[PDB]
Design a protein around this ligand. Structure first.
Ligand SMILES: CCc1ccccc1
Ligand SMILES: [Cl-]
Ligand SMILES: [Cl-]
Length: 162
């Protein structure tokens, strides 16, 4: 199992603009277009991202291409973050995917706001980190996805995704 497969399960795939769990215009595999309430602003952003006049609809290939760029960016964001990098480099491969998932979902600032959890993961105190991760708006808002990511950090296996 890998990051792409993991995120494809967590995010789904939609070829027409839709609103995410927070009510924000998104498309494809969890690609946020804009936080603005305007559908046009969203369509504008979409056309700018695809490089053509899409009219709110994209193909599967286009979706996958945004997806590759977004995963790439998430990882790169982690590596560039002084607070995140050290933790990320301390993790094994499976857990790294859990870290990428979080950043992809909520951005680097967001995650960078989980200080205590970061420290606990860095110390490899899995169960404790798992409990601390659960005390968050993230877990309360998207509990089933949070549980899957949390189990992944807790166990270091893909069991939650099987
Ligand atoms: C807090 C989860 C995490 C860990 C390392 C890097 C990014 C994100
Ligand atoms: Cl883009
Ligand atoms: Cl959920």
């Amino acid at each position: 199992m890998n990051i792409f497969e993991m995120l494809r399960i967590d995010e789904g795939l939609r070829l027409k603009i839709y609103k995410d769990t927070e009510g924000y215009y998104t498309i494809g595999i969890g690609h946020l277009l804009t936080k603005s309430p305007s559908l046009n602003a969203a369509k504008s952003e979409l056309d700018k991202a695809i490089g053509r006049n899409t009219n709110g609809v994209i193909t599967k290939d286009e979706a996958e291409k945004l997806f590759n760029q977004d995963v790439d960016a998430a990882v790169r964001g982690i590596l560039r973050n002084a607070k995140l990098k050290p933790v990320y480099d301390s993790l094994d491969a499976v857990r790294r995917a859990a870290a990428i998932n979080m950043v992809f979902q909520m951005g680097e600032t967001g995650v960078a706001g989980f200080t205590n959890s970061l420290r606990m993961l860095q110390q490899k105190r899995w169960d404790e980190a798992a409990v601390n991760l659960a005390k968050s708006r993230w877990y309360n808002q998207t509990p089933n996805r949070a549980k899957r990511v949390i189990t992944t950090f807790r166990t270091g296996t893909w069991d939650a995704y099987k």
